Amino acid sequence: ASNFTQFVLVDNGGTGDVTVAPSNFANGVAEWISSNSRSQAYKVTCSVRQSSAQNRKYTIKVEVPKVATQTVGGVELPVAAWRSYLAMKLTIPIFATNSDCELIVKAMQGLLKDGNPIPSAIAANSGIY
Amino acid sequence: ASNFTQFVLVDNGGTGDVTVAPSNFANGVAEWISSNSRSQAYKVTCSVRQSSAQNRKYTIKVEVPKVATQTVGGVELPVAAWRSYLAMKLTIPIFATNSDCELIVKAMQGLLKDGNPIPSAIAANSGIY
Amino acid sequence: ASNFTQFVLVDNGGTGDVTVAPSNFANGVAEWISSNSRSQAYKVTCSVRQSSAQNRKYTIKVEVPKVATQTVGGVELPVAAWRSYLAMKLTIPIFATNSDCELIVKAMQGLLKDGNPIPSAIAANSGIY
Amino acid sequence: ASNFTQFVLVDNGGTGDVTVAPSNFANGVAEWISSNSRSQAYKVTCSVRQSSAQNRKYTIKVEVPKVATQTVGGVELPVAAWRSYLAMKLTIPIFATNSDCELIVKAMQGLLKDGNPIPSAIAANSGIY
Amino acid sequence: ASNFTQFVLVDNGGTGDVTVAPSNFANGVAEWISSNSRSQAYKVTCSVRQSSAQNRKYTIKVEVPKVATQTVGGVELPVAAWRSYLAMKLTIPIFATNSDCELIVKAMQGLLKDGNPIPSAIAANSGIY
Amino acid sequence: ASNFTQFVLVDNGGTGDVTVAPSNFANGVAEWISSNSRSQAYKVTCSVRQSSAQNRKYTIKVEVPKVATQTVGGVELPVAAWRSYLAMKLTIPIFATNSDCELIVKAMQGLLKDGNPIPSAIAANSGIY
RNA sequence: ACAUGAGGAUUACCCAUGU
RNA sequence: ACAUGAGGAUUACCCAUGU
RNA sequence: CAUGAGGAUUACCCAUG
RNA sequence: CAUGAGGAUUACCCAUG
């Protein structure tokens, strides 16, 4: 098939959608970025390795930029005022079936589903209590 | 909000759902676990501190049991053969507003949304190709 | 050509066939695996580099699971008791033409063709006698 | 029975066939070569050893020569312009049944069957993509 | 999705066309090679790195071989009488948007377009007069 | 007769076209510059020298400016926010006939032709994936 | 001597790292 | 080089403890 | 690492900070 | 002078023989 396809990272109902696409697979790290200047793009990187003698380890990273225009030396340039970084590590024992793995995925989706504790607190600049 | 409540981690339409509930709150770290022996349960923990002068950081963790051939309630060794571990670290600059944070959440949701590349690879014991 | 596609590794006439599909392409190394837990799957990887000034070299690897008494999806230890490993290294002088290479392939096919000495010994837990 | 028999290494439909035969078993290494001068012959060598305290290891080697006539010192001699070398190592756990081993063999045949990705790329001076 | 596909390097109508196909992609260096004798193949390599804080830098390379037969000692081999070497480096600020790049490319295509000074002088064994 | 004429560097239909014209030719280095503010002009340079006994070597260079206004102290000047830099070197044996060269050029044009891997990756702020 | 290498070769040899 | 950290970051990098 | 109308056996070598 | 998937203020600088 090829899973290296572009996808929608931030869905705002067809319009305003942040869509990210394959930009590089050099060095075994898969990369997707938005269509901006390199300095303002959104970035998503992913890679897997057979870490332990019996584990596999996914290393995923996402960069969310706060686009802004900065005046440097009398000239204006496109840039990010700051970035938000998400980095995650997932270790799955080699004994895990596809059925087993799908479970992991569904669980991760449930973790961030609108309404649940965590994404709630996050988007409210709050902790859990 | 007042978010430390029970929720659905794995949703199978109601029948077969995996629900995780508040199990501990020592040190400010919120913990949720499913109704199993701790050796086989689903666990979720989360906390927020200010990593540095400019950023705050969420540290979210999830543990997912291997189920295929699992023996409910039994002693399954080695432990690293029956468990998967997720470790997330979300860094957010003190300048992010509640809206900013909401987008960051959506970005995460999209990353793992069903059908998109990342979960696809994971759920198929695959990398990017 | 445009060859990184799924194919049949073990053919049992259609019924019982073992199919292996593209599972990863990091670093240029193509990987194919069967639909199993990685601990029990069939794996195939392949790559080509120029070993030296005069030759190129293919490095092909295959992993075949032990099935007799196998427990589908379960945790089978020790790993070296349940897996077989094939490692091939094909060195070809830069002077070999496409025809030259075709013969080299046929030579390989014949080496393992059903009925010939080598596979006969292997498939019978035997040496040459 | 005795598996140490001659076989056809390169099949071109009865005519033009490269046929190889038993030439030496000295030192525990089985050898087959074509009917040429020693300098232009095709060679196939095979051997097995009880490597690990629980593995068996087949070590197979094949030499495909590019026959040519070289004029050395005003005199012509039969020789190989260059050779193509195939070397493979197969490790099978002692617990493997004959049924298990046959599987390994069938898998190796499938790997090189005309049409499949690998032999395809090889005979086209190409990599997999 | 991959941009590591094979393509036409030299276009001579429909036939007489030089085609180059993926060979290897180790160390973040993509490589393409035309078919048949590697000794006479065409070669193309490409890569990108963050040269500095502000710029990214591409390094492209192309080899054009002069096909010939080399007879020595009465032994002939397919070789390259010689090779023409192209090597280029393109540096682009991180402020370059997806548009800024398309423009940079047009400039490159225009530089070599038929009739224009440079490609003309080259193909005429000439300099600028 | 002169090949030191002005030409179209960037082709945007009939209007929006970037034109470059002879500026200077000192030291055997031909130079072209687009019109208006030199500070925002496009630049192309070219030259050839006998690199060795067997080869001649071309050195081509192109500058693509990002036009912008720089206000400083309330004084604005037409400037280049930044520039994209292209520099290439082509080496060709003295045995290359007028044909051998035309081929080398086609290879160059093909390398950058629309749709092909390299020009694509560049214009997409991407590498090879 | 094993083990490991998308390590090399004049191809039943050699190299490097590990024990 | 792994392992571990509710360790840090300019974010495919660094730090500390462990072997 | 960065520049060279610096050479090549073409992802290497050299001068120079 | 020659190599570098070596940087740039882009016919310059640097490492390396």
Side-chain angles (χ1 to χ4, degrees), chain B residues 66 68-69 77-78 81-82 124-129, chain C residues 4 22-25 33 36-38 72-75:
Chain B
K66 166 183 171 52
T69 78
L77 280 321
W82 295 88
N125 282 306
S126 294
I128 304 304
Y129 61 101
Chain C
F4 194 22
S23 59
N24 180 285
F25 196 53
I33 60 161
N36 308 258
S37 56
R38 286 200 88 83
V72 188
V75 180

mmCIF file of all heavy atoms in Angstrom, chain B residues 66 68-69 77-78 81-82 124-129, chain C residues 4 22-25 33 36-38 72-75:
data_model
loop_
_atom_site.group_PDB
_atom_site.id
_atom_site.type_symbol
_atom_site.label_atom_id
_atom_site.label_comp_id
_atom_site.label_asym_id
_atom_site.label_seq_id
_atom_site.Cartn_x
_atom_site.Cartn_y
_atom_site.Cartn_z
ATOM 1 N N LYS B 66 -0.799 -6.979 26.904
ATOM 2 C CA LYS B 66 -0.862 -7.842 25.733
ATOM 3 C C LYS B 66 -2.025 -8.770 26.066
ATOM 4 O O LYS B 66 -2.053 -9.363 27.153
ATOM 5 C CB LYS B 66 0.413 -8.667 25.581
ATOM 6 C CG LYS B 66 0.252 -9.794 24.591
ATOM 7 C CD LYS B 66 1.485 -10.639 24.490
ATOM 8 C CE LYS B 66 1.190 -11.869 23.662
ATOM 9 N NZ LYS B 66 0.578 -11.512 22.354
ATOM 10 N N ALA B 68 -3.669 -11.180 23.527
ATOM 11 C CA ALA B 68 -3.647 -12.435 22.790
ATOM 12 C C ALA B 68 -2.923 -13.531 23.569
ATOM 13 O O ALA B 68 -1.707 -13.458 23.756
ATOM 14 C CB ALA B 68 -2.977 -12.224 21.460
ATOM 15 N N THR B 69 -3.679 -14.542 24.001
ATOM 16 C CA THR B 69 -3.170 -15.690 24.762
ATOM 17 C C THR B 69 -3.036 -15.373 26.250
ATOM 18 O O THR B 69 -2.607 -16.211 27.047
ATOM 19 C CB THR B 69 -1.786 -16.237 24.220
ATOM 20 O OG1 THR B 69 -0.704 -15.407 24.659
ATOM 21 C CG2 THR B 69 -1.778 -16.283 22.703
ATOM 22 N N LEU B 77 5.048 -14.095 33.248
ATOM 23 C CA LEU B 77 6.430 -13.618 33.178
ATOM 24 C C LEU B 77 7.061 -14.052 31.862
ATOM 25 O O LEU B 77 6.682 -15.084 31.299
ATOM 26 C CB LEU B 77 7.277 -14.178 34.328
ATOM 27 C CG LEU B 77 7.207 -13.562 35.725
ATOM 28 C CD1 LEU B 77 7.093 -12.050 35.600
ATOM 29 C CD2 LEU B 77 6.038 -14.118 36.482
ATOM 30 N N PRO B 78 8.019 -13.266 31.337
ATOM 31 C CA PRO B 78 8.561 -12.006 31.860
ATOM 32 C C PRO B 78 7.610 -10.851 31.613
ATOM 33 O O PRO B 78 6.892 -10.834 30.615
ATOM 34 C CB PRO B 78 9.857 -11.849 31.082
ATOM 35 C CG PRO B 78 9.517 -12.452 29.770
ATOM 36 C CD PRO B 78 8.815 -13.717 30.183
ATOM 37 N N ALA B 81 7.291 -8.930 28.263
ATOM 38 C CA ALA B 81 6.747 -9.658 27.133
ATOM 39 C C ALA B 81 5.250 -9.428 27.058
ATOM 40 O O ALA B 81 4.636 -9.601 26.009
ATOM 41 C CB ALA B 81 7.040 -11.145 27.282
ATOM 42 N N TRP B 82 4.668 -9.011 28.172
ATOM 43 C CA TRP B 82 3.235 -8.809 28.219
ATOM 44 C C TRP B 82 2.749 -7.383 28.352
ATOM 45 O O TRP B 82 1.553 -7.155 28.541
ATOM 46 C CB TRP B 82 2.654 -9.625 29.362
ATOM 47 C CG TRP B 82 2.791 -11.075 29.156
ATOM 48 C CD1 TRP B 82 3.846 -11.863 29.505
ATOM 49 C CD2 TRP B 82 1.851 -11.923 28.503
ATOM 50 N NE1 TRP B 82 3.619 -13.157 29.107
ATOM 51 C CE2 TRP B 82 2.398 -13.219 28.489
ATOM 52 C CE3 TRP B 82 0.594 -11.712 27.928
ATOM 53 C CZ2 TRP B 82 1.731 -14.303 27.921
ATOM 54 C CZ3 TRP B 82 -0.068 -12.785 27.364
ATOM 55 C CH2 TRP B 82 0.501 -14.066 27.366
ATOM 56 N N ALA B 124 -0.100 -2.286 12.657
ATOM 57 C CA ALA B 124 0.204 -3.312 11.682
ATOM 58 C C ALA B 124 1.616 -3.848 11.852
ATOM 59 O O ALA B 124 2.150 -4.488 10.943
ATOM 60 C CB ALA B 124 0.031 -2.754 10.293
ATOM 61 N N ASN B 125 2.210 -3.605 13.021
ATOM 62 C CA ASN B 125 3.577 -4.047 13.282
ATOM 63 C C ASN B 125 4.459 -3.569 12.132
ATOM 64 O O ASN B 125 5.321 -4.310 11.670
ATOM 65 C CB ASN B 125 3.651 -5.573 13.350
ATOM 66 C CG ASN B 125 3.157 -6.122 14.664
ATOM 67 O OD1 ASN B 125 3.620 -5.715 15.730
ATOM 68 N ND2 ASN B 125 2.224 -7.069 14.600
ATOM 69 N N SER B 126 4.242 -2.337 11.672
ATOM 70 C CA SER B 126 5.011 -1.804 10.556
ATOM 71 C C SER B 126 5.660 -0.462 10.791
ATOM 72 O O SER B 126 5.395 0.221 11.772
ATOM 73 C CB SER B 126 4.124 -1.681 9.320
ATOM 74 O OG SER B 126 3.703 -2.948 8.855
ATOM 75 N N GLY B 127 6.527 -0.095 9.860
ATOM 76 C CA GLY B 127 7.196 1.184 9.922
ATOM 77 C C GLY B 127 6.595 1.963 8.774
ATOM 78 O O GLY B 127 5.470 1.672 8.358
ATOM 79 N N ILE B 128 7.324 2.947 8.258
ATOM 80 C CA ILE B 128 6.828 3.730 7.131
ATOM 81 C C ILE B 128 7.479 3.169 5.858
ATOM 82 O O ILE B 128 8.690 2.903 5.827
ATOM 83 C CB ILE B 128 7.160 5.235 7.306
ATOM 84 C CG1 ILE B 128 6.602 5.741 8.644
ATOM 85 C CG2 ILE B 128 6.579 6.038 6.159
ATOM 86 C CD1 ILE B 128 5.122 5.525 8.832
ATOM 87 N N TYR B 129 6.669 2.975 4.819
ATOM 88 C CA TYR B 129 7.147 2.411 3.561
ATOM 89 C C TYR B 129 6.325 2.887 2.370
ATOM 90 O O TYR B 129 6.768 2.641 1.218
ATOM 91 C CB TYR B 129 7.083 0.894 3.636
ATOM 92 C CG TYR B 129 5.676 0.373 3.841
ATOM 93 C CD1 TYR B 129 4.934 -0.136 2.775
ATOM 94 C CD2 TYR B 129 5.087 0.379 5.105
ATOM 95 C CE1 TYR B 129 3.641 -0.634 2.961
ATOM 96 C CE2 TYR B 129 3.796 -0.114 5.302
ATOM 97 C CZ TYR B 129 3.081 -0.622 4.226
ATOM 98 O OH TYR B 129 1.819 -1.131 4.425
ATOM 99 N N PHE C 4 8.820 -3.045 -5.104
ATOM 100 C CA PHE C 4 8.488 -3.256 -3.689
ATOM 101 C C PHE C 4 7.010 -3.552 -3.441
ATOM 102 O O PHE C 4 6.267 -2.721 -2.918
ATOM 103 C CB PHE C 4 8.933 -2.052 -2.849
ATOM 104 C CG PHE C 4 8.943 -2.310 -1.366
ATOM 105 C CD1 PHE C 4 9.017 -3.607 -0.867
ATOM 106 C CD2 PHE C 4 8.913 -1.250 -0.465
ATOM 107 C CE1 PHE C 4 9.062 -3.846 0.510
ATOM 108 C CE2 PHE C 4 8.958 -1.475 0.914
ATOM 109 C CZ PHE C 4 9.033 -2.776 1.402
ATOM 110 N N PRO C 22 4.984 -5.456 2.131
ATOM 111 C CA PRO C 22 5.849 -4.330 2.495
ATOM 112 C C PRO C 22 5.498 -3.846 3.882
ATOM 113 O O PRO C 22 4.340 -3.524 4.152
ATOM 114 C CB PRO C 22 5.529 -3.298 1.425
ATOM 115 C CG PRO C 22 5.250 -4.140 0.241
ATOM 116 C CD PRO C 22 4.360 -5.216 0.818
ATOM 117 N N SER C 23 6.496 -3.803 4.759
ATOM 118 C CA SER C 23 6.284 -3.380 6.138
ATOM 119 C C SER C 23 7.175 -2.225 6.566
ATOM 120 O O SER C 23 6.925 -1.597 7.592
ATOM 121 C CB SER C 23 6.495 -4.559 7.089
ATOM 122 O OG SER C 23 7.801 -5.087 6.959
ATOM 123 N N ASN C 24 8.221 -1.948 5.800
ATOM 124 C CA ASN C 24 9.097 -0.835 6.138
ATOM 125 C C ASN C 24 10.132 -0.556 5.064
ATOM 126 O O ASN C 24 10.560 -1.469 4.363
ATOM 127 C CB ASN C 24 9.794 -1.088 7.473
ATOM 128 C CG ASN C 24 10.717 0.045 7.859
ATOM 129 O OD1 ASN C 24 11.805 0.179 7.303
ATOM 130 N ND2 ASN C 24 10.279 0.887 8.793
ATOM 131 N N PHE C 25 10.538 0.705 4.936
ATOM 132 C CA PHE C 25 11.521 1.066 3.922
ATOM 133 C C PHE C 25 12.565 2.083 4.383
ATOM 134 O O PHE C 25 13.125 2.826 3.572
ATOM 135 C CB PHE C 25 10.804 1.593 2.679
ATOM 136 C CG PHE C 25 11.675 1.642 1.454
ATOM 137 C CD1 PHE C 25 12.364 0.510 1.033
ATOM 138 C CD2 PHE C 25 11.797 2.813 0.716
ATOM 139 C CE1 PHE C 25 13.165 0.546 -0.109
ATOM 140 C CE2 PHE C 25 12.596 2.858 -0.428
ATOM 141 C CZ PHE C 25 13.279 1.725 -0.840
ATOM 142 N N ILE C 33 6.868 -8.513 5.775
ATOM 143 C CA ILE C 33 6.565 -9.430 6.871
ATOM 144 C C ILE C 33 5.169 -9.985 6.701
ATOM 145 O O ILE C 33 4.338 -9.410 5.999
ATOM 146 C CB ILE C 33 6.640 -8.805 8.268
ATOM 147 C CG1 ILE C 33 5.658 -7.659 8.377
ATOM 148 C CG2 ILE C 33 8.035 -8.368 8.562
ATOM 149 C CD1 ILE C 33 5.356 -7.301 9.797
ATOM 150 N N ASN C 36 1.535 -11.507 11.429
ATOM 151 C CA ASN C 36 1.657 -12.222 12.694
ATOM 152 C C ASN C 36 2.230 -11.268 13.717
ATOM 153 O O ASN C 36 2.475 -10.099 13.418
ATOM 154 C CB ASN C 36 2.624 -13.403 12.548
ATOM 155 C CG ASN C 36 2.276 -14.311 11.381
ATOM 156 O OD1 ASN C 36 1.700 -15.381 11.562
ATOM 157 N ND2 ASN C 36 2.622 -13.885 10.172
ATOM 158 N N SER C 37 2.427 -11.761 14.932
ATOM 159 C CA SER C 37 3.045 -10.942 15.961
ATOM 160 C C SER C 37 4.474 -10.932 15.437
ATOM 161 O O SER C 37 4.915 -11.919 14.840
ATOM 162 C CB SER C 37 2.971 -11.634 17.330
ATOM 163 O OG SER C 37 3.547 -12.932 17.303
ATOM 164 N N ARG C 38 5.207 -9.845 15.623
ATOM 165 C CA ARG C 38 6.551 -9.849 15.085
ATOM 166 C C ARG C 38 7.392 -11.007 15.586
ATOM 167 O O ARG C 38 8.305 -11.452 14.898
ATOM 168 C CB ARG C 38 7.239 -8.516 15.341
ATOM 169 C CG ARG C 38 6.687 -7.439 14.431
ATOM 170 C CD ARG C 38 7.620 -6.258 14.287
ATOM 171 N NE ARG C 38 8.611 -6.374 13.211
ATOM 172 C CZ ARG C 38 8.376 -6.089 11.931
ATOM 173 N NH1 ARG C 38 7.180 -5.676 11.551
ATOM 174 N NH2 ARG C 38 9.349 -6.180 11.034
ATOM 175 N N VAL C 72 0.084 -19.916 18.275
ATOM 176 C CA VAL C 72 -0.289 -18.654 17.659
ATOM 177 C C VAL C 72 -0.633 -17.479 18.565
ATOM 178 O O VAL C 72 -1.632 -17.498 19.282
ATOM 179 C CB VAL C 72 -1.451 -18.862 16.711
ATOM 180 C CG1 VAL C 72 -1.706 -17.591 15.939
ATOM 181 C CG2 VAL C 72 -1.151 -20.021 15.785
ATOM 182 N N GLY C 73 0.206 -16.449 18.507
ATOM 183 C CA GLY C 73 -0.012 -15.246 19.290
ATOM 184 C C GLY C 73 0.632 -15.230 20.656
ATOM 185 O O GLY C 73 0.786 -14.170 21.258
ATOM 186 N N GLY C 74 1.010 -16.405 21.144
ATOM 187 C CA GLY C 74 1.618 -16.507 22.456
ATOM 188 C C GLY C 74 3.067 -16.063 22.548
ATOM 189 O O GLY C 74 3.731 -15.775 21.534
ATOM 190 N N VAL C 75 3.548 -16.008 23.788
ATOM 191 C CA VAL C 75 4.915 -15.605 24.096
ATOM 192 C C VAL C 75 5.755 -16.870 24.130
ATOM 193 O O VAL C 75 5.679 -17.627 25.088
ATOM 194 C CB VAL C 75 4.990 -14.925 25.482
ATOM 195 C CG1 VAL C 75 6.401 -14.521 25.779
ATOM 196 C CG2 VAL C 75 4.070 -13.716 25.529
#
